[PDB]
Each structure stands twice: as C-alpha cells, then as structure tokens.
Curated annotation (Swiss-Prot):
Domain Helicase ATP-binding per the UniProt entry, residue ranges: 11-173
Additional remarks: Present with 825 molecules/cell in log phase SD medium.
Effect the entry attributes to changing residue 127 to Q: Loss of DNA translocase function of TFHII
Protein name as annotated: General transcription and DNA repair factor IIH helicase/translocase subunit XPB/SSL2
Domain Helicase C-terminal: residue ranges: 227-381
The species this protein was found in: Saccharomyces cerevisiae (strain ATCC 204508 / S288c)
Disulfide bonds: none
Function noted in UniProt: ATP-dependent DNA translocase. Component of the general transcription and DNA repair factor IIH (TFIIH) core complex. When complexed to CDK-activating kinase (CAK), involved in RNA transcription by RNA polymerase II. May have 3'-5' helicase activity alone, the TFIIH core however has no 3'-5' helicase activity. Also involved in transcription-coupled nucleotide excision repair (NER) of damaged DNA. In NER, TFIIH acts by opening DNA around the lesion to allow the excision of the damaged oligonucleotide and its replacement by a new DNA fragment.
Description of how the protein assembles with itself and partners: Component of the 7-subunit TFIIH core complex composed of XPB/SSL2, XPD/RAD3, SSL1, TFB1, TFB2, TFB4 and TFB5, which is active in NER. The core complex associates with the 3-subunit CTD-kinase module TFIIK composed of CCL1, KIN28 and TFB3 to form the 10-subunit holoenzyme (holo-TFIIH) active in transcription. An additionnal subunit, TFB6, plays a role in the dissociation of the SSL2 helicase from TFIIH after transcription initiation. Interacts directly with TFB6.
Source taxonomy: Eukaryota, Fungi, Dikarya, Ascomycota, Saccharomycotina
Family statement drawn from the similarity comment of this UniProt entry: Belongs to the helicase family. RAD25/XPB subfamily.
Motif (DEAH box): 126-129
Subcellular location: Nucleus
Residue positions, PTM Phosphoserine: 390
Top-level taxon of the source organism: Eukaryota
Length: 408
DNA sequence: TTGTGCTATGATATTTTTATGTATGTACAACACACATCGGCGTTCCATAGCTATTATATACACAGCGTGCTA
C-alpha cells in the first residue's frame, strides 16, 4: 500500500536512532509495516498486545514472512513459553503479564530472562491510545531499545495524556487521512446520522426528576426510540442489509434484544454461545440483526452489516464509541461501486445524552467523515407492527420503567 | 453572624477482562489381600452276487404219528 511506503521512507531516510508513532486504519496493513521494519533491523522484536487473537495474527504475519518454529521466534504467554536466540527474534507479549505487581505463576522469570539477558532492539506497541496508564509507564520504564515504533489507529482522548506520548515513545511521524485512503481503497463511505425522536411528557418530567446514570434508564427506554428502532430495523431488512446494534448498557441491550427477538452477546456470557451466534451471523441469512455490547466489539469486528445503530451511550466515552465505530467502518472493505455505510444515533429531544453524542459527532468531523441530521424518515407512520405506539402500551412501559427505577 | 456556591482533592461508585486456585468431570491403574493353582443319530433306496425249492437212485438209522390187541 502506497501510504505504507510513505511511512517506510522515514525509516529509509536516517536509518539509525528513530522513534515515532504511525497512524494507520485497522483494515490497513500496519503489521506488514512491522514485518518490513523487522526485516530492516533484524533483531529481537517484542510486540506488546492486549489479546491473544492479536498474538495469533502477528504469528500469522511471521508465517507470511519466514520461520516461526526454529529456536528464534519466541512466544510469551500465561500458557506456555518458547526459547529465543540473539541477532534475530520475533516475540509477542501481553501488557498484563509483563506489568503485574506480586502475583506470579512461575512465568515472570521467563519474561525477566528476555528483559534481563538484554535481547532487544525494536519495540512495537499495538494500540498506542491505551498507553496513557500507569502499567504502560512501568512497561516503558522496564524496557530500553535502539528503535521504537508505535502502531495505532486513533488517538482521541479527553484525559489530556495523549500529548505525553511525544516523549514517552516519540512524536507522531505520519498521520494518514482516512478520506484519501477511502479514495485509494473503498473502506465504506461513512454516513453519520442522528435520529431525533420526540420525547413523551411522563418520561420527560420523570427524566428531569432523575439524575446521574439512572436517568439513562429513562433516556433509552423511551417508546419513540422503540418505534424508530423497529422502523430502522424493518427498513434495513427491507433493503437487504444486516444490522448491528451497539449499547453501552447491558440492561438496555437485553431489553431491546428480547423485545426484538434477536441474539445478544453481553458480559458473563459463555464463549460457545458467542461463537454460535457469530457463525449464525456469518452463515445464516435469517439472522441479520445482532445486539453486541462492548465485549462483542472489542474482541472481534465483522466485515458484514452496513447498518450500525447506536442506542445506549455513556458520558465522556464518546471517543471510544467513535473508535469502535471506526473499527467497524474500516473492517468493511471490498471495493464496491456503492458501499454506503449508515450510522444512526437514536437520540431523544431535551435529554442530557444527545449533548455528548454531539461531541462524538465532533470527533467524527475531526476525522473528515460526513455528518447530517435526521429528524424522522417518512414511513414509520405506515408500520402497524410498532410497539409502544398506543397509550396503553406507553403507560405499561412507564410502569415498567418506574419499577426499574425502584429496583435501582 | 450564619448560610450558600465554586476549585480542587478525597473518596465513593461502575465496568471490562487477564489469569488463578478450587471444584467438577473423567482417566488410570493399581494394591494387596482374596483367591487360585500345584505337590511331597435313524431311516431308506439301488447295484451286486449268492442262494432258495426239487428229483431221478441206492444205502442205513432215528424220530413222530397212526391203527390195532388187552384189560380193568
């Protein structure tokens, strides 16, 4: 990819003594850039990752290059260990395993052999936006190499600590514009859209009488959000496109999941059921609407479903939802003549959550994506299958929300 | 004088996910007495070769049955 050689030209310029951060999309090949840099340096390279799936991907890249089984390419994890050799090495480690404090499973010595014997020379950190934390400062404080590299896709955080990475690892060298990359490769056009649904009177006065995170249980459970949600679901099913529903709250995800009758993936869920739901979403055309929480978004991103719906949201964590949204957008690439990606933000008027979703839309403006407002698409008035459209169901839902407030 | 409001820290309240020690399900073999071993056939059809009854004649000998005399 041209931008990858545009990033490698900086390494080809000076050669020795360099450190910086390279911003590349998730769908791009930053791991290939790490492989090329590993071929240019030829030394013990350590790749800092947070999940085993990324370790398996880096191992697949090592297989795409050459060798992995002979005593040279090592693997560090809490399950097994593998030997290494000087002058050339490729190993992937976990942040929580290298960090620690005093808990030990007779494996911290195996890491202190890679760090004690001084077999290093190249540092690779996956997702640098997570570095602003004490454990990563300890990791950097326990390592020292000749060349450092930071592979990440985003860096927008409101912790005011992203600027420290300019001296902890190095200043950002190349930031690729996702619009020009969309022109190089169709990574699904980004259509940002907020749905403005009216707010009922009872949920408005009860919403004002509530506060903190409890008023979210009155912002999400609005009947017009159920009507507009069903209208968007039936609309996308009529267009023949799969639907992914995001929710920062597990309770709302279970409510919409059970009322819509679709599979759901949330916390404390068996992994076999998660894999079954994933296979049903990949193969079965009857399941075109999935309800995914943060566990289903951080662990895996699927290239299907051009329809992304956002209902639940948390205060301040708008940039993280923009990063996950960006992961689902960049995950969809196949060079199509159309390829229209639709992001909907179900927001209710006069609520305290839309005013942060606007900050998320500001983050979506900083990336160059297109944003437009949507009050209501004509067609919901012709859907007799809408729930909570009658005053009876609205009063019953009001009583259910009041009971939910009495439980919390 | 006493009550009320913002900066900042202090503490208090949520959320996701790594491995870990204990629990649960499932193998394995296996220990040492409990026990074991040892000894100083019936039934039917076809080709085969022997084997059945008879006589003309002499000789001599034994065996079973019948016709006639005597007396009680």
């Amino acid at each position: 990819r041209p931008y990858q050689e545009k990033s490698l030209s900086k390494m080809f310029g000076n050669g020795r003594a360099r450190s910086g951060i390279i911003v590349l999309p998730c769908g791009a090949g930053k791991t290939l850039v790490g492989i090329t840099a590993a071929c240019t340096i030829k030394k013990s390279v350590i790749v800092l990752c947070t999940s085993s799936v990324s370790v398996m991907q880096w191992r697949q890249q090592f297989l795409x290059x050459x060798x992995x089984x002979x005593x040279x390419x090592x693997x560090x994890x809490x399950x097994x260990x593998x030997x290494x050799x000087x002058x050339x090495x490729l190993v992937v480690s976990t942040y929580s395993m290298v960090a620690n404090x005093x808990x030990x499973x007779x494996x911290x010595x195996x890491x202190x052999x890679x760090x004690x014997x001084x077999x290093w020379g190249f540092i690779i950190l996956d997702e640098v936006h997570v570095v602003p934390a004490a454990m990563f400062r300890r990791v950097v404080s326990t390592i020292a190499a000749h060349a450092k590299l930071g592979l990440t896709a985003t860096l927008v955080r409101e912790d005011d600590k992203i600027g420290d990475l300019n001296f902890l690892i190095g200043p950002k060298l190349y930031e690729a514009n996702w619009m020009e990359l969309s022109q190089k490769g169709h990574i699904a056009n980004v259509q940002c859209a907020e749905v403005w649904c009216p707010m009922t009177a009872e949920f408005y006065q009860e919403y004002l009488r509530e506060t903190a995170r409890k008023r979210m249980l009155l912002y999400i459970m609005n009947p017009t959000k159920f009507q507009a949600c069903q209208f968007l679901i039936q609309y996308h099913e009529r267009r023949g496109d799969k639907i992914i529903v995001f929710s920062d709250n597990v309770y709302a995800l279970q409510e919409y999941a059970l009322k819509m009758g679709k599979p759901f993936i949330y916390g404390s869920t068996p992994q076999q059921e998660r894999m079954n739901i994933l296979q049903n979403f990949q193969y079965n055309d009857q399941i075109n609407t999935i309800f995914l929480s943060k566990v289903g978004d951080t662990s895996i991103d699927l290239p299907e479903a051009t329809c992304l719906i956002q209902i639940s949201s948390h205060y301040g964590s708008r940039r993280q939802e923009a990063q996950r949204l960006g992961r689902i957008l960049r995950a969809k690439r196949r060079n199509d003549e159309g390829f229209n990606a639709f992001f909907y933000s179900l927001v209710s008027k006069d609520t305290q959550e839309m005013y942060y979703s606007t900050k998320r839309q500001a983050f979506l403006v900083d990336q160059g994506y297109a944003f437009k407002v949507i009050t209501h698409l004509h067609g919901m008035e012709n859907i007799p299958n809408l729930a909570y459209a009658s005053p009876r169901e609205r009063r019953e839902l009001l009583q259910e929300v009041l009971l939910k407030n009495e439980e919390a």
